[PDB]
């Protein structure tokens, strides 16, 4: 079945996006059509995965006879699957025998005849709370077009035999011919591996049907369905032959243009008009300039002064293909907290064709560039910061990628005074360096690291989350693994890398509960119980 996602211009676009459609994955909306211009533009539609909004239609007849069912995945306003209103004389939705979710709204239709007598009881399903059908079973057009009553368990409209393999429209999904409650799972449990495994017979979900792979440009989501595009919290990534909607690692890639190229080609800095154009933005394409004109304001460019609280918009930036110039910062902030998440400064286009990181003449105590790890092309100049203390500690040669890069840290707070005022980084910090006064602002640390912050040592013997050390880092092991005082509660990651499990253990993997009711091999559910030794045994 083919699928789809001035008044003259409206009809053309509508007919274009609906002439070949047979199953609509979205909402069928026929609105604003002029007199005597509809001519079999949409007659083959048999399924709408959403709501059917036929509003303000001057045409005498909107053909929708084949329409078998409206899914109701969306609504017009609320619980509104069929929205026929303010139109239209003949609307023969004869095949319409089911509206899973939503109700039909009848309003402002004086010309609509032969539809007030329709049996909406057989179509609308359990959504009568908002059924204002107020504007003999026959949709119209004399005979032939009748309501074909059938209602007044996976077949929605009707049945053509007492078999699930033969029905008009499946209530939930249709693998290839039989009506299934859900699509074959993509993960299959195998008692031999005591865990989940990719299921070959498992098929992705394509709207109201199950497909081994989704054709055209569709992206499989986490729950097995392949929607048209990945969500806001997900990104498109193609591992195997089909791309999948992998979850974004926090704020994922949103490449915007920086200062010098694009809409900010003639802009000088990130002033108030610039701010908000960098919201939830990562991997700036261009340079990032923060000049005094931003906070002072500019009259010639007609830009109000940038209030310092809007500088947190740049907290999303994790890469800058150009350079970072901070010639002005709010004086009430002791560090560049807007660039704490910045990780790479490619420097492709550097200040004066030289500096890619330039913190100049600021009133900040620390740099606050904890996540900064790579400065590829340009060098670094941190000067004029009369209150900058933890600046020379960082081994800049580690971040640099090109051997020719240098660093011009000069005229900041003296190191002698820096250590005299008690402003020396934490002892939990490898000589590699420190970005600030706390272990969070540490390039590297003496023994371990719990994320950005690094403690004295992992919870190998005592601790609340009971970390286990690996590659000089604290990893909180599976919660299932109970704390162990004699040795280390957990050898490694996963529920199969600890000596003692607080909850039951399925084979080698400690689990909250033994696997019960999960789909297993040969399309058979598997259930497991627990013995006195907390081991999960197959039933």
């Amino acid at each position: 079945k083919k699928v789809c996602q001035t008044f003259e211009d409206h009809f053309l676009s509508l007919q274009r996006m609906f002439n070949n459609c047979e199953v609509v994955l979205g909402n069928l909306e026929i609105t604003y059509v002029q007199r005597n211009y509809d001519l079999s533009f949409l007659k083959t539609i048999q399924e709408v995965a959403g709501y059917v909004l036929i509003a303000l239609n001057t045409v005498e007849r909107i053909p929708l006879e084949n329409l078998q069912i409206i899914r109701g995945n969306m609504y017009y306003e609320n619980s509104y699957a069929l929205a026929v209103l303010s139109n239209l004389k003949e609307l023969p939705m004869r095949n319409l025998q089911e509206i899973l979710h939503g109700a039909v709204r009848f309003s402002n239709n004086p010309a609509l005849c032969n539809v007030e007598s329709i049996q909406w009881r057989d179509i609308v399903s359990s959504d009568f709370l908002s059924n204002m059908s107020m504007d003999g079973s026959c949709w119209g057009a004399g005979e032939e077009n009748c309501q074909k009553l059938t209602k007044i368990n996976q077949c929605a409209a009707g049945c053509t035999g007492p078999r699930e393999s033969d029905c008009l429209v499946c209530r939930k999904f249709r693998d290839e011919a039989t009506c299934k409650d859900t699509c074959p799972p993509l993960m299959l449990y195998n008692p031999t591996t005591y865990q989940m495994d990719v299921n070959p017979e498992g098929k992705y979900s394509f709207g109201a049907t199950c497909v081994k792979k989704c054709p055209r440009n569709y992206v499989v989501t986490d729950h097995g369905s392949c929607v048209r595009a990945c969500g806001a919290d997900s990104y498109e990534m193609e591992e195997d032959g089909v791309r999948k909607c992998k979850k974004c690692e926090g704020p994922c890639r949103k490449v915007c243009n920086g200062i010098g190229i694009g809409e900010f080609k003639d802009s000088l800095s990130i002033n108030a008009t610039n701010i908000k154009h960098f919201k939830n933005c990562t991997s700036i394409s261009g340079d990032l300039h923060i000049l005094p004109v931003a906070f002072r304001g500019d009259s010639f460019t007609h830009t109000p002064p940038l209030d310092p609280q809007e500088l947190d918009i740049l907290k999303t930036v994790k890469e800058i293909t150009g350079f970072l110039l901070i010639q002005a910062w709010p004086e009430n902030r002791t560090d560049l907290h807007a660039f704490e998440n910045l990780e790479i400064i490619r420097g492709r286009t550097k200040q004066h064709g030289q500096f890619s990181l330039a913190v100049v003449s600021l009133n900040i105590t620390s740099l606050g560039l904890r996540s900064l790890k790579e400065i590829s092309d340009g060098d670094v100049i941190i000067s004029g910061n009369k209150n900058l203390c933890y600046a020379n500690t960082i081994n800049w040669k580690k971040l640099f990628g090109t051997s020719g890069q240098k660093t011009k840290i000069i005229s900041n707070r003296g190191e002698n005074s820096c250590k005299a005022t008690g402003q020396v980084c934490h002892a939990l910090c490898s000589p590699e360096g420190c970005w600030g006064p706390e272990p969070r602002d540490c390039v590297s640390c003496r023994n371990v690291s719990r994320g950005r912050e690094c403690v004295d040592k992992c919870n190998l013997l005592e601790g609340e989350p009971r970390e286990f050390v690996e590659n000089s880092e604290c990893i909180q092991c599976h919660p299932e693994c109970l704390p162990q005082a004699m040795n280390i509660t957990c050898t490694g990651r996963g529920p199969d890398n600890c000596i003692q499990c607080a909850h039951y253990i399925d084979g080698p993997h400690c689990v909250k509960t033994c696997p019960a009711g999960v789909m297993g091999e040969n399309n058979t559910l598997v259930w497991k119980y627990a013995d006195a030794g907390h081991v999960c045994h197959l039933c």
Partner: single-chain antibody, 230 residues
Framework: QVQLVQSGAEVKKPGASVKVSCKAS????????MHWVRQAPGQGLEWMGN????????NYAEKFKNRVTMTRDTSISTAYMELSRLRSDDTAVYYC???????????WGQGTLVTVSSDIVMTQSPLSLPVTPGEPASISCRSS???????????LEWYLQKPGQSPQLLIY???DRFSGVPDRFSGSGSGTDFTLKISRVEAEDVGVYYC?????????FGQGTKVEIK
């Protein structure tokens, strides 16, 4: 303190080129626009283009776009204005102003008189209005279009060019008065009509008042009312 110094005392010939400097001191010269404004005799102040010393990105007026070149000297903190193909009407007084944040041309250069010889129209309803010391005066100004900028801030300004000195900002906004000027001046108006109301005319108040707009691409001044004592 901020102090902008121009070369001054320039005399040229028609068809020649003149270049004047602006030694800007007391502040970071690269953090502020360096506007250039001309005051031809018989006419009010006329904007002729600016420059951003931090990057050298200059803007221009349509009457000087193909005729004037402005370049900055970052190391010595001095902006320049080169006017070529001088005509008979090019004789004027050239000021190197300095754009602020809520206002325009906070500080002005003393002025360079280049005497050479062989757009939202802002018009002030009065012209050379005489008053008596003590009696309140009122200078109205009419704009050709609505100068309320899209951002919601109208860049209406009143400049008092006292005899022998450069223009000085009095009302930095439609009504917001500048720092260092008395409460006597009180700008007023909205939309298209703007009037400046002096509550008490004093001896020092004599001078030419120019209603200025900066909300359009070319900033334009008004003809100027020569307020004088009766």
């Amino acid at each position: 303190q901020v102090q902008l110094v121009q070369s001054g005392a320039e005399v040229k010939k028609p068809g020649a080129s003149v270049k004047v400097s602006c030694k800007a001191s007391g502040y970071t010269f690269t953090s502020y626009w360096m506007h250039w404004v001309r005051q031809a005799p018989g006419q009010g102040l006329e904007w002729m283009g600016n420059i951003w010393p931090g990057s050298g990105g200059t803007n221009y007026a349509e009457k000087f776009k193909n005729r004037v070149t402005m370049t900055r000297d970052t190391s010595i903190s001095t902006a320049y204005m080169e006017l070529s193909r001088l005509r008979s009407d090019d004789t004027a007084v050239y000021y190197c102003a300095r754009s602020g944040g809520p206002y325009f041309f906070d500080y002005w250069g003393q002025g360079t008189l280049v005497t050479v010889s062989s757009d939202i129209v802002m018009t002030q309803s009065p012209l050379s209005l005489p008053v008596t010391p003590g009696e309140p005066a009122s200078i109205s100004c009419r704009s050709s279009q609505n100068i309320v900028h899209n951002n919601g801030i109208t860049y209406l300004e009143w400049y008092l060019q006292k005899p022998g000195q450069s223009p000085q900002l009095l009302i930095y906004k439609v009504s917001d008065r500048f720092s260092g000027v008395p409460d006597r001046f009180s700008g007023s108006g909205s939309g298209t009509d703007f009037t400046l109301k002096i509550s008490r005319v004093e001896a020092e108040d004599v001078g030419v008042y120019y209603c200025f707009q900066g909300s359009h691409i070319p900033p334009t001044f008004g003809q100027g009312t020569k307020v004088e004592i009766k």
